[PDB]
Each structure stands twice: as structure tokens, then as C-alpha cells.
Amino acid sequence: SGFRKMAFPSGKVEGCMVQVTCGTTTLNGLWLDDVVYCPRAVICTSEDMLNPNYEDLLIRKSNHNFLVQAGNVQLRVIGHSMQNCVLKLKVDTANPKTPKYKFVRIQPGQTFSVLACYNGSPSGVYQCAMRPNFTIKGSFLNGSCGSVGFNIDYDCVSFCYMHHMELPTGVHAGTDLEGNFYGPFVDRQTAQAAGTDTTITVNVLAWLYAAVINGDRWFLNRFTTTLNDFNLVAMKYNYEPLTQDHVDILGPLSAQTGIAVLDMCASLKELLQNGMNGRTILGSALLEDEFTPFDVVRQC
């Protein structure tokens, strides 16, 4: 029993984290087999960052301009190239700690674990969702560039995020591991802003099922609603529309609790219209939307 914001164990990723220095700029890299992956922003300096031309900056570099440190050992760079917004530094030593892994891009509404790192050194682990507006509400300080986000599927680490930058609202933006940004953001220090966000409805429903599984039942009611009358209420409160795919996803959880999805939707509608009136659900006074149906099943 109980329900926590739970991250994947980070050991497999900690053994891949290195430090990358070019000039006076340092950040984190990910060392898998004989390649080190890092944000291409490592090749910029203070003045370059407003309007850098990265192809120009990289042509002016050679292998010996990149200092890669794996704990104590310096790694010898024997090739370099750019793929979208990440650099690939080929090194002369395959990482003996390389796990089985994949590079996967995630969808808004999906969750992942973040291993925050500074100077190649893992500092903390936490769980994040990709927001509908392709930002994440992370916790990141200067030096965290190149920290990675991931899921573990059995023995296999699916890397899905590399951290690049902080937006003015204090939310965070980054790329997948082939260097393609999530959302309409670029790796230069300009006046970019996140678009308007929405609440991830299927996730809020999943969390309500977790609450019931854990004995929190006060928000339940006898009513049911139709998928369309619900979706009509969802729009007014800035919630995403619910699809039949989502109802299907929630199937196992509705089976385990005996509460039809449209039954739980009627509870969500009432919570949205009347609030909680001083009560809590799974320790929170807000409707929580950063747990997927998969997260709930795995933990419960």
C-alpha cells in the first residue's frame, strides 16, 4: 500500500555519465559503447550563445579540443560529429558498464526518470512528465546540461531525454537522444516561451484509480456520465479530451476496482466543479496528472 512519485533505479545510467569540457565550457555527457553524447552547446562560449552558428563552430574544432573525463580516467577523443542538437564524440574505449539500451522519443503525457548530474557526477533522481506543451517541470541548476531522462523496461534502459535549457518560466526544455528538440525550442539564448499547457486527463483518472486501490474513496459517487458530456466539461477546465483509446488503457484499472471509466469520469467532473472542500486524495489537495496508467499498475 501507499503511492509515491517513484523513479527507476538509476545505477545503470550512473555508470554512463561523464564530464565533457571544450574550452571553458563544461557539461555532462552519456557514454555508451565507444561514443559520448552531449549537447552541442558545449562548443559555444558566452558571446556565441545569442546567435550561434553551430556548423561554423564545429568546423573550427578538432578532436583534441574535447576533454572527456570518466571519473578519474580521461578518455581519448578520436572522432567527432554533430547530429541535430547533440554532439557524438567517438572515443577509443568502449564503456564496460554499457547497459542494453534504446533511444526512444516519448509522447506528451508520458513519464520518465531524470538523473540530475553536475560535472559528470550524478546528484539526484526524480520522476517527470512530458507536458502537453513539450516542457518538463524539472529541477536543474547551471551545470546540469546533458543530464538524461530514461525508463527501464526490463534490463533495458530506454533513453528519452537530454536536458538543454531553462525557459523564463523556470520550466525546462531538451531533446531526444538523436538531438531533436521536444517542442518548438532552439538551443540559443533568446526569448522563447512555452505555449499554454493543459492537464493530462487520462493520467488524472489513473491517479484516481490508484487512490481507490489505496482506500481513498470519498470522491466516488453513484452517477455516471457519457464520454461526450465529460469531454464538454473537460474543455472548460483546460483538460485534454478523453478518447476511447484512453478508456481502453484504463480498462485493467477499472476491472481491478470495479468502477467503470465513465463512472470515474463522473467523479472527476464533480471534483472539477466543486473542488475538494478541505479534503485530500493520496496526500494531495490537487488533482495529480503526472502518473500514467502504466505507472499506477506497476506501483499498485
Binding site: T26, L27, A41, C145, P168, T190
Partner: peptide, 8 residues
């Protein structure tokens, strides 16, 4: 307000 590439 400008974006911050959080290198060190």
C-alpha cells in the same frame, strides 16, 4: 527574460 543553456 532569455533562455538559459545550463552548461557550466
Amino acid at each position: 527574460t532569455f533562455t538559459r543553456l545550463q552548461s557550466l
